[PDB]
């Protein structure tokens, strides 16, 4: 099997936002596939394909209080890796709204 | 990037076998892998690794009027070439069954 | 003590081809070994695991008149079937 | 049809840089970042992204070199044009 | 219960033979051979081996005499008929 | 003190048979034990019980690229001569399973 | 005759990746030997020699359901204290 | 010239302890050489060559609010890469000491 | 004075045994190893080792017997209290 990215991690969580950073595997690769979108919800999901030369991604537009999850697998060819992933929750409010 | 298998071929069709044979990619490979079940089902999957000499498979124990795909994919060093498929469908009964 | 399979038989034996068709095994079964190579050759042998959904087998490249053997293993958990085996030779160049 | 902007590059080091842009100002299907050697137009890599992400690090890149970034913003096939800068990896 | 089947005894010398069997369509517990002399009940030795078991050699054979070799299937209680075979050792 | 087999020899390894043969000792003796397994394993253990007259077997059922390892005793009356014993290890795959 | 290592345990373990942590000797050492590799394989090992400053290692590009051991020697002078052993056995792939 | 290794990052910091983890560089490489010690004493220096699977180090036995100094260099056949370099400041004794 | 620990005997068979065990946490300049019949006094062997060996095969026991091994180490004056395990020899 195909080397996968590894100790995945969400940091900098705030009400809308998220930054993602991985490692990619040892060996050379064509791409990265960064899949994300809200964890209990199959249809809500955003696929991005990156160089395997990029570790990072800051995440915006999410929704706030908010469970998510975030799937990165390592392509070479058109063989794909087993993913690495992890859930995260974004930040809530503590005061209410309009009116 | 690897060049896949081709001229992929399904042939001798019945109720319930298919004969497979396919033309391997020209450069030196380490492998074939060919991948089969259900149209009707991405669960229902199989993948066998073959040698690159391998160039024809029968599969039996197929169920009658079911439509099957087949995808044949090379293997060579840490890369897949994208697949070459193709799918069938299985004879049928025409007199019925039994009592 | 694993179900093993049998009636293996090699038709349409050509110069470098040859058409190998076998009977999985009478009890249900993870996975059936076919292992080949040349019969004089101990270290020549290829081996695929394949299913039971799967009976034939077409080789290729293999050098002319040329002695093979097939020998065919069932697999289930970690119990292997005593090997089954049939040995057949490549056609000869007529020039 | 606006692109992004006050594109930042920051914790560039001798092989990594983290780019940051803002963007613009109208609901777009996304944008294409360009990397690659300034002195170089042969040397060129793109990324297809969504409009929500808003930060990469690049990484594998040559030390005490210059590189050139161009962002551009797509709608299916209308692109706004090119935003662009330019910085340079730490040295020896 | 299948008996094993295509008994096979090779390299006959004038002491030794190497006996070879092909395991029952069904899986077996375990399996019982036989062998001695044919015309001679006394003289007959049998040992109990594990199914995986499917080749024997024996020595100290007398030279240019006739042996049977009896094996039979077994699953604890139930047992199968047996399997046959006779040879002959070589001679000078 | 009651000499063991000896020159325990195993010979034809494959995927997953092997073949093991040794001589007797000199002096007559009521019996020879050969047991077998998987070395790192205790649970895993089969003994035979051959009369001297046996020099070899054929194993099968073997695991693949797996260590085993072989013991040889000699029975007269209540007595056991020390073992002769060897270590293989069956040949291994290339290929891979299925899906 | 030397100061052993001890108390090694592995966590965070995934498909490829292993964290391995222990506990340096009660006597000061010069330096600590950390070998690993498939246990099957008795020509696998890889070894790098550490010191006591360090305690934990993250090992990566392993493969998966596979079987490592790890043994941890500590060394002063020519002295080497008896190998301390431990072994883990990565996650297995779903699909 | 060769490429260096990446993306260092200290984390985990605390009274006498560190967690160092960083990306080996993408070409193959024979080792990677990581060197340590005060930020205040270039005597006070440690240098482990480690095989290039390996991505992470922790610390122990740092003294407390210390200032450290990381070097992570990469080597193949005769050659070191430039060093990737970080700093980094142990926790500190907020309450005092005993009597 | 620590004694070993982890005293293991593994590969056991009719008449053989592998005795392994872990060195203490301090270093020894010795260890004495005992072991015979558990029920017998007069039948009792002691050897003295390097604490450099950590395992010992033991040959010639008798079938189906229970065996104690005590390990003591020592630094010539001092010694530290036993370690001991027992174990069964196979039976057929």
Known sequence: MLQP???IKVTNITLTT??????PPI?????ILVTFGRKNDPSDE??????SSI??????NLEPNTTYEIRIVA?????????????FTTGSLEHH???
């Open 5 to 7: 990215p590894f100790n």
């Open 18 to 23: 998220a930054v993602v950073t991985w490692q």
């Open 27 to 31: 060996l050379p690769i064509e791409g």
């Open 46 to 51: 955003t696929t991005v394909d990156l160089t």
């Open 55 to 60: 570790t990072s991604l800051t995440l915006t």
């Open 75 to 87: 392509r070479n060819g058109q063989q794909y890796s087993p993913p690495v992933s992890t859930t």
């Open 97 to 99: 709204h309009h009116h």
